[PDB]
Amino acid sequence: GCCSDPRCNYAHPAICGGAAGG
């Protein structure tokens, strides 16, 4: 749930790849 969390969004602005994991 990276796309849902602002941490992964602000941390990975280039591409929401973390979303793949969660």
**Look-up of token digits 């992964």:** 8
**Contact of 19 with 1, CB cutoff 8 Å:** yes
4 vs 21: CA distance, rounded Å: 12
Q: Give the determination technique.
A: NMR
Breaks in the chain after residues (C–N exceeding 2.5 Å): none
**Contact of 16 with 3, CB cutoff 8 Å:** yes
10 vs 14: CA distance, rounded Å: 9
DSSP SS3 for 10:
helix
DSSP sequence for 1-22: -TTTSHHHHHHS-S--GGGGT-
